[PDB]
Structure 1
Amino acid sequence: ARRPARCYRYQKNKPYPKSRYNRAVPDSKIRIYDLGKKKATVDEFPLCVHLVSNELEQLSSEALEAARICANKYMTTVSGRDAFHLRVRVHPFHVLRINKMQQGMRGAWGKPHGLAARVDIGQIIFSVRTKDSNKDVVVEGLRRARYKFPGQQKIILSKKWGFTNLDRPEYLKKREAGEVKDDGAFVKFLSKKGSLENNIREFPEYFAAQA
């Protein structure tokens, strides 16, 4: 079934998603995108690590599948299965075609082959949030996943708290007051606009000035 991945490497054709014109397409190889303790609060896992791309390329679905298993298998055995939260930030929507076969070129439009992603320079692929002490396992976990993909990518330690869009000291300023409350997986913040009645329903620790 599979051709070599070198053929469907570069972004040549326009985006060709599954719709009412394409209709009949095969299922994605990757299925579940979140792994580890995904019912964990925001306060548990501060230290964030990314796996950022550095090329304008196409990662296939089954390339992500093996990369997702390999990183999981190492990090589970070493540090235990509930010491992290892995998230895949790339979904394959682009359908690839194949000219599987009146004549050679006398009428030639390709059948659907398989799915793929479209990654850009500076785009994040993988993301892991963990404890402070358990850094080395996460960096070495994403090392082996780097081999399964084509092209060049680099691991980066983030300055932000977890998956939040807030810096290390910035999150502490707001959480020490009553300006943040936990949602479930992510988190909700106070806003200075809105109705003042239902701004007091939530955030009852704020509107006090004491502790």
Structure 2
Amino acid sequence: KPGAMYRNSSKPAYTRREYISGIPGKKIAQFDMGNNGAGPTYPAQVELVVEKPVQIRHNALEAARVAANRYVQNSGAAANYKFRIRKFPFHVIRENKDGMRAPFGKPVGTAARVHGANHIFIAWVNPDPNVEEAWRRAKMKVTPTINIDSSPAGNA
């Protein structure tokens, strides 16, 4: 199904699992990447900031995450970097798949609501920003236009 069907916050928050059942698992493999054994004690901290409020399905969350991290293997399988996708897909989404009769939909997926300006991804690295390219690929697979933002780096 197209992102067109769910990218907008056009429905009330539907996340209570005590009342919703049969929610598909998440396609997002991990939320912590890189040397997650270590702390965010790095020199440079870049982040991908979404420019529009939107709902991002776990479908796109996993494609963007892979697209970025997989590429961040320009540093090495066990390289010296950190990477965190900080949002979780809490919104349960449905699809009415009798025409418009009794059309409440059936759970078909989950998405993460992200407001304009929130950062969806954050990386921590040493002056080794192959990450800015990692996000160019990441922002390439999520609905909104985004802006890559270096948070702590005067090391031009």
Is this a same-fold pair by TM over 0.5?
A: yes
List aligned pairs for 1:124-163, cutoff 5 A.
124-131=119-126, 133-135=127-129, 137-159=130-152
- Letter of the 1:30 counterpart: I
Q: Does 1:107 align with 2:102?
A: yes
The one-letter code of the counterpart of 1:153 is I
Tell me the alpha carbon deviations over residues 117-152 of structure 1, each in whole angstroms, 9 at most, x when there is no partner: 111011010000011x212x1111111111111121
Task: Give 1:74 shift.
Answer: 1.4
Partners of 1:108 and 1:121 lie apart in 2 by: 31
Q: Distance in 2 between matches of 1:75 and 1:31?
A: 16
Shift of 1:24: 2.2
Quick check: 1:18–1:25 contact (8 Å CA) kept in 2?
A: no
RMSD: 1.6
Q: How many residues align?
A: 153
Q: Indicate how the Cα distance of structure 1 residues 41 and 27 shifts in structure 2: closer, same or farther if over 3 A, else same.
A: closer
TM-score, normalization: structure 2?
0.91
Specify the alignment match of 1:7 in structure 2: 5
Q: 2:32 maps to what in 1?
A: 34
2:67 and 2:138 in contact (8 A); partners too: yes
- The structure with the largest strand share of the pair is 2
Unaligned runs of 5+ in 1: 161-167, 169-211
Counterpart code for 1:68 = R
Rg larger in structure: 1
**Matched residue of 1:51: which SS?**
strand
- Secondary structure of 2:47's counterpart equals strand
Q: 1:31: Cα distance to partner?
A: 3.4
Q: What TM-score comes out, normalization by structure 1 length? A: 0.68
Q: Deviations over 1:186-206 (max 9, x none)?
A: xxxxxxxxxxxxxxxxxxxxx
Alignment partner, residue 80 of structure 1? 76
Separation (CA, whole Å) in 2 of partners of 1:141 and 1:64: 14
Find the partner of 1:56 among 53, 57, 61. Answer: 53
The answer on whether the counterparts of 1:51 and 1:125 sit within 8 Å (CA) in structure 2 is: yes
Gaps of 5+ in 2: none
Q: Structure 1 residues 73 and 110 mapped into 2: Cα distance closer, same or farther (>3 Å)?
A: same
Identity among equivalent pairs (%): 37
Q: Distance in 2 between matches of 1:104 and 1:37?
A: 52
Task: Name segments (4+ residues, structure 1) moved above 3 Å.
Answer: none
